[PDB]
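Supplementary material to the annual report.
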Amino acid sequence: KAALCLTKRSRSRKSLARTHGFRLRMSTTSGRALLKRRRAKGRKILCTKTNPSSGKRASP
Amino acid sequence: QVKSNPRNNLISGQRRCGKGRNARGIITARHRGGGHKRLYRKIDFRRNEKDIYGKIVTIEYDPNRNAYICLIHYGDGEKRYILHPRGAIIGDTIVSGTEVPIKMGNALPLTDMPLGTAIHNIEITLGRGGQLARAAGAVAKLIAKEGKSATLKLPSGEVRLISKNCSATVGQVGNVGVNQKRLGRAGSKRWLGKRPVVRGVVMNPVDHPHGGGEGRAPIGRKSPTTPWGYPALGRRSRKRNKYSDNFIIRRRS
Amino acid sequence: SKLQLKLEQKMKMKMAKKIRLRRNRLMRKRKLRKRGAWPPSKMKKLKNV
Amino acid sequence: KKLKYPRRILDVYQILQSPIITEAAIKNIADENSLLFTVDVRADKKMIREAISNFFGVKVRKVNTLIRPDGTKKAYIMLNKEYNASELAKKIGIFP
RNA sequence: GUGAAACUAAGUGGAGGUCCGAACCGACUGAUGUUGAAGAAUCAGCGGAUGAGUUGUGGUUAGGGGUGAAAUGCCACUCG
RNA sequence: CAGGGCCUAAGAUCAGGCCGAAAGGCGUAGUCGAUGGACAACAGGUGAAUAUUCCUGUACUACCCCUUGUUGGUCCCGAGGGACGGAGGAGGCUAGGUUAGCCGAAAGAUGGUUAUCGGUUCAAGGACGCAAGGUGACCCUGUUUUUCAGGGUAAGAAGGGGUAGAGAAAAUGCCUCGAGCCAAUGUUCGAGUACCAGGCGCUACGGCGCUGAAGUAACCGAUGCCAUACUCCCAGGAAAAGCUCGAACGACCUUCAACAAAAGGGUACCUGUACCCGAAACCGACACAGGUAGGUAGGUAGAGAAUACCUAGGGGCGCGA
RNA sequence: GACCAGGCCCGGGCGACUGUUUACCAAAAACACAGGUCUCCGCAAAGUCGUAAGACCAUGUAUGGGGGCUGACGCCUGCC
Ligand SMILES: [Mg+2]
Ligand SMILES: [Mg+2]
Ligand SMILES: [Mg+2]
Ligand SMILES: [Mg+2]
Ligand SMILES: [Mg+2]
Ligand SMILES: [Mg+2]
Ligand SMILES: [Mg+2]
Ligand SMILES: [Mg+2]
Ligand SMILES: [Mg+2]
Ligand SMILES: [Mg+2]
Ligand SMILES: [Mg+2]
Ligand SMILES: [Mg+2]
Ligand SMILES: [Mg+2]
Ligand SMILES: [Mg+2]
Ligand SMILES: [Mg+2]
Ligand SMILES: [Mg+2]
Ligand SMILES: [Mg+2]
Ligand SMILES: [Mg+2]
Ligand SMILES: [Mg+2]
Ligand SMILES: [Mg+2]
Ligand SMILES: [Mg+2]
Ligand SMILES: [Mg+2]
Ligand SMILES: [Mg+2]
Ligand SMILES: [Mg+2]
Ligand SMILES: [Mg+2]
Ligand SMILES: [Mg+2]
Ligand SMILES: [Mg+2]
Ligand SMILES: [Mg+2]
Ligand SMILES: [Mg+2]
Ligand SMILES: [Mg+2]
Ligand SMILES: [Mg+2]
Ligand SMILES: [Mg+2]
Ligand SMILES: [Mg+2]
Ligand SMILES: [Mg+2]
Ligand SMILES: [Mg+2]
Ligand SMILES: [Mg+2]
Ligand SMILES: [Mg+2]
Ligand SMILES: [Mg+2]
Ligand SMILES: [Mg+2]
Ligand SMILES: [Mg+2]
Ligand SMILES: [Mg+2]
Ligand SMILES: [Mg+2]
Ligand SMILES: [Mg+2]
Ligand SMILES: [Mg+2]
Ligand SMILES: [Mg+2]
Ligand SMILES: [Mg+2]
Ligand SMILES: [Mg+2]
Ligand SMILES: [Mg+2]
Ligand SMILES: [Mg+2]
Ligand SMILES: [Mg+2]
Ligand SMILES: [Mg+2]
Ligand SMILES: [Mg+2]
Ligand SMILES: [Mg+2]
Ligand SMILES: [Mg+2]
Ligand SMILES: [Mg+2]
Ligand SMILES: [Mg+2]
Ligand SMILES: [Mg+2]
Ligand SMILES: [Mg+2]
Ligand SMILES: [Mg+2]
Ligand SMILES: [Mg+2]
Ligand SMILES: [Mg+2]
Ligand SMILES: [Mg+2]
Ligand SMILES: [Mg+2]
Ligand SMILES: [Mg+2]
Ligand SMILES: [Mg+2]
Ligand SMILES: [Mg+2]
Ligand SMILES: [Mg+2]
Ligand SMILES: [Mg+2]
Ligand SMILES: [Mg+2]
Ligand SMILES: [Mg+2]
Ligand SMILES: [Mg+2]
Ligand SMILES: [Mg+2]
Ligand SMILES: [Mg+2]
Ligand SMILES: [Mg+2]
Ligand SMILES: [Mg+2]
Ligand SMILES: [Mg+2]
Ligand SMILES: [Mg+2]
Ligand SMILES: [Mg+2]
Ligand SMILES: [Mg+2]
Ligand SMILES: [Mg+2]
Ligand SMILES: [Mg+2]
Ligand SMILES: [Mg+2]
Ligand SMILES: [Mg+2]
Ligand SMILES: [Mg+2]
Ligand SMILES: [Mg+2]
Ligand SMILES: [Mg+2]
Ligand SMILES: [Mg+2]
Ligand SMILES: [Mg+2]
Ligand SMILES: [Mg+2]
Ligand SMILES: [Mg+2]
Ligand SMILES: [Mg+2]
Ligand SMILES: [Mg+2]
Ligand SMILES: [Mg+2]
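Predicted assembly:
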């Protein structure tokens, strides 16, 4: 019943960083190539989706 | 006939979960999925515990096979499940061993079975556990025995040699009228976790060898075909030289 | 000799039923906390809703 | 059994950073006999209780921590009923 | 009712991919809208509504692929 | 209180192991992983912005401390338990509501009238307790079988004890003891100098200080509770820990050391906590006629959570004339 | 007496039926279905996925598992 454009919904930050998070890029080889690549371009943030396990941004 | 007991230690929840998905997670065996949660009953197919006197306490439903299953006790207090033989009634006594009476539910090697008997739950391999004739109403006659080898006629009609030292059980497998059921509606299939099947002729040419012709397709294929490109009808798939071949005599008709 | 067994078994029964019942309100309180109208005060501001 | 390891390894002399003096805290002192101390984020309650119990020599009832949105731990230290708050208020230089 | 059984009112019972209809899921007709209030909506009606139902959270399957009650449909407004 | 210091599901990673140009793929123990198991707190008050968190009352878990009582305890292991569907209706109850009764105030410029307006509230928890409820085998006689009445049978229910087999507990078999049992709710404490209609006084005319009457009964009645209680059905309805029990095997620890108990005192880990959340704060590029799980469920009519008009509470749609 | 709140009857085609479908121009006579029938497969099964190891099928065993056509029930299914 929701419009096509709604692809990004409200999803638990926990779930996202279990997908695009830091500790996941570190697992695969291709991810490590990712991080070398981003460091080369020199981005301020390596992993956009990430998340404190506990803290102010924590998802329980 | 069917009355639910509490749970004996024989009933667990551990199992494969995705039905028909392999390691890669791909659907391999098609059409499964959906359907009621089930628990695994640990059957005793081996019946390997010898020379103690077992007693049928109850008869119970099993979701996993279409036969019935019996809770049996012993004097030792161990409890097993066995496949329910046909005509067996609560209070009955069964036993396995070498020198044993021949009656319903008793289990013995093929050395000791009088020829012409009707058997179920048949090991092809010593101590591997019983394999052949485990479904409802399934039964196999022991026709002849010679040398180290005994001959059976399997419920498919196929006549085949096995080892004379492999255990088996007398009596045909119970719950014979199960295929006399008529499901009556779609839902009734879905309850069994069998999903709907699409006919080949219907799908697009990319999806399947009988692909969309204009209106309705006769199969122009010079032959009826698998989803994967092999002749659908009467092409024998048995591995040509498979080790079993010396054993197999007449083929099911 | 029967009065001993009866008073012992009623001591036991009083105990087990004490613990049981205690356990039961505890669970009820939990289910309510989960569902989320718990603290009876909460429920009494909203009775008229 | 063994030596008791403190939750982290800190240096106690840096954990209590300072009293927080605003209109808010002072009446918390008045009512509740409770001091207000900005402390190191990495610092816990057991460490704050030992620290202040030894430092000003007062027995402390209870400690309540907090973390600002700015990531600076803030601790309410409510002392016993015996030792008055305003005592330590004049001892420290916090004037109610 | 006959010796067995069949046959027939009665009560009890509460089956059903039963019926009517909100929530909820849909999307049949019309009107409006078309530099929209909105990159698919509002309005009045309309279909299912104990099931082959709806949904939440957490997962799986990935492009010579996946998934498909099969429309070349869907796979982040992108899919021969 | 919600997650973590507890346990596992789908799933993930995976020591060794198997395979593979490389990167890697499969896979066992292990370890992760809640949306589930386990586990202890409520009422009132304060309050520019927090409150089951701060204050006052009564509570409850887990440790430590003493007294007493025993001598082996701890883990590994063996077990019982935890532990489970759908549908259906009938009970027995509360939550709410309505009307009485009690108490206080009332004159609201009209033809009449007090028929009017307000109040009648209290939690977790602890002690008690359970029938017209529900369950407790059969046989004879009647009440429609039922709720019942007399007799009898000898385990015939929760619940306990014993024995036997390689056999501690368990399972299993034989013997025995028990007519009660179940649990919502209820009575009493908690609980009154709490709360509160009004009354008195101040007005920075915002709010404030002061004293406080009555505080019961009947009838409606849940979709909530007992309750995994029944009855029926086929499609047959999670695991593991805490928990209860226990010999041999292994490991480790041992005397004022450890464990067992009823009192008494003491002691109290991290992280979230603001605000919005049928949204001008999330998702729709907008202060966008849209999407967004769950909880609570008042009145009159009504079969109803539909509809219409209202309470509590919130609003008058950020261009007008 | 407001709001709320079925128009119905007689015919025929197609499809038995509840369902599913082309998000955003098509909801149907299309798909599914219970049922039917043909063929493969004796368990180290056939089939599917992988270079392989192995995984699914299945902790199943021919009253079971693949695959092809048709499509409830009734009457049938001719010749080459
Ligand atoms: Mg971004
Ligand atoms: Mg179970
Ligand atoms: Mg069990
Ligand atoms: Mg994978
Ligand atoms: Mg079919
Ligand atoms: Mg089909
Ligand atoms: Mg087509
Ligand atoms: Mg495919
Ligand atoms: Mg092709
Ligand atoms: Mg074709
Ligand atoms: Mg044509
Ligand atoms: Mg309402
Ligand atoms: Mg404060
Ligand atoms: Mg530091
Ligand atoms: Mg905190
Ligand atoms: Mg009726
Ligand atoms: Mg229906
Ligand atoms: Mg009607
Ligand atoms: Mg349309
Ligand atoms: Mg509409
Ligand atoms: Mg409708
Ligand atoms: Mg209608
Ligand atoms: Mg209609
Ligand atoms: Mg309807
Ligand atoms: Mg039904
Ligand atoms: Mg679901
Ligand atoms: Mg969806
Ligand atoms: Mg689809
Ligand atoms: Mg994109
Ligand atoms: Mg798209
Ligand atoms: Mg397209
Ligand atoms: Mg697992
Ligand atoms: Mg791996
Ligand atoms: Mg390795
Ligand atoms: Mg593993
Ligand atoms: Mg965890
Ligand atoms: Mg949880
Ligand atoms: Mg808790
Ligand atoms: Mg916890
Ligand atoms: Mg607030
Ligand atoms: Mg409060
Ligand atoms: Mg407190
Ligand atoms: Mg009080
Ligand atoms: Mg305690
Ligand atoms: Mg255990
Ligand atoms: Mg459960
Ligand atoms: Mg009821
Ligand atoms: Mg009442
Ligand atoms: Mg009245
Ligand atoms: Mg009166
Ligand atoms: Mg007047
Ligand atoms: Mg009144
Ligand atoms: Mg009480
Ligand atoms: Mg007590
Ligand atoms: Mg009674
Ligand atoms: Mg024993
Ligand atoms: Mg013994
Ligand atoms: Mg026993
Ligand atoms: Mg009544
Ligand atoms: Mg309902
Ligand atoms: Mg509800
Ligand atoms: Mg049941
Ligand atoms: Mg030992
Ligand atoms: Mg002990
Ligand atoms: Mg708060
Ligand atoms: Mg808040
Ligand atoms: Mg606006
Ligand atoms: Mg808006
Ligand atoms: Mg909105
Ligand atoms: Mg109403
Ligand atoms: Mg009406
Ligand atoms: Mg009424
Ligand atoms: Mg309404
Ligand atoms: Mg108003
Ligand atoms: Mg105008
Ligand atoms: Mg209408
Ligand atoms: Mg109607
Ligand atoms: Mg017609
Ligand atoms: Mg005609
Ligand atoms: Mg015509
Ligand atoms: Mg149709
Ligand atoms: Mg209909
Ligand atoms: Mg769909
Ligand atoms: Mg369309
Ligand atoms: Mg659709
Ligand atoms: Mg349609
Ligand atoms: Mg279609
Ligand atoms: Mg194979
Ligand atoms: Mg077959
Ligand atoms: Mg088939
Ligand atoms: Mg067709
Ligand atoms: Mg036909
Ligand atoms: Mg006919």
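The two ends of chain C are 61 Å apart (CA to CA).
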